Amino acid sequence: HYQPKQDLLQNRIILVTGASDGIGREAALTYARYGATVILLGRNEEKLRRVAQHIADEQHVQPQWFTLDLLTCTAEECRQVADRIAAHYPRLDGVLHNAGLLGEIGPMSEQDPQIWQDVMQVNVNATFMLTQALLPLLLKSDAGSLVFTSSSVGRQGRANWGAYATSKFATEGMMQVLADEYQNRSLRVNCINPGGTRTSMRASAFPTEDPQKLKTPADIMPLYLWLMGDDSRRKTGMTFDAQPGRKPGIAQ
Template sequence: MTETKTLDGRVAVVTGASRGIGRAAALALAEAGAHVIAVARTQGALEELDDAIRRVGSSATLVPLDLTDYDGIDRLGAAINDRWKRLDIVVGNAGILGNLMPIGHITPKVWGQVMDVNVTANWRLIRSLDPLLRMSDAGRAIFVTSGAASKCKAYWGPYSVSKAALEALVRTYAAENATTAVKAMLLNPGPLRTDMRRAAMPGEDPETLRTPEDLAPHFVRLASPGSTDSGTIYDFPTDRILTPQATR
């Protein structure tokens, strides 16, 4: 008898799915039985992910999309509605670091790019996909945040501001779904062995850090119908659920 997987038959969107945290999350969701709609800018990397998903016996739909193509996000929602009439899981992982420099030196272009990807694109995802999540018996939305949202370290201005705004966005969305079957969570991965971390901390030994694959099972847990947490932050470094009042 075939063992039933946690996410059998469920449909999941993962952004930034071609590498790092997004790739590990997509593969873990697929291993748990979900059909993964993998969104990223790089076609070749998406095809490599598709091969990996097939090797674990699951399937994927590849969506090459720049998340600043907001009309494209709307088209994604329409296509999911046409094919499945619902969506069970959203993982909003895609994000950019921007430049690490004094706030007064940040150009309007860089500021706009960080806000467009880290905040506005996630709002557009919610706007497009919320009706589909509400059609699920247990819609789950998980957005990747950062300790930078509350630490507000020097030179991290755009990134810190964008993650603080993302947290307010997701907590508001969770509050608006308090009486529905949709749960919305934030996930703080902490320091992981990723390209973004390497760019931010070039002198750090990556071998001292945990990997996206270490984090990935927690996406499966939060995406599962049995998960009831909403409007809070799962903090991977401490393995705790943090309330909005808690500090990191």
């Protein structure tokens, strides 16, 4: 139902994490198609260069990319990325925290403790540290938009989703704290729950699922566009479902 003009994001500088594949890749491509100056973040250089070349072929402007491994980045290793961005851009109008680690799908009694900690580190701790590093740039926007990525399991825990579900609950908590802090300020903060979407992470979570029964990243982009454009400027502290009527769990 949301069909914005093709220049919705013209002149908006938007950073996308996990831009090298799946939903983040589609978000980067789509934001560029809608006029934005996109900044790509990921850990795999070759995958990032590929997405950037795809965007340059269509927009005739090469977007910049930065590699940052959220699992191993120390507190200072995130601020360094913000300094590099600040050297080339005067502000950030949007930040989409899309990067995420699934970890292990299995019972709590078997959850590998190191993997548990890695999931919490990428999805929660490093996501927080990166956010802290980028807030100054976000506050230079006339109406900045900060978006975190949750999941169906971020609102209702489900058996065998261990660290990932716990990390998505944490994500919603973090978003709500930030939304309240910036309530009457220039920055809005919200979460997007994409719902079951056709990506390799989803296929790993549900190996018996038929991915053709799922919506594609392209299909769920309207919400992604809406949160970065001016139509959502009065909305903060909310978790929005990209697929409100989708039955949670494996596709039937």
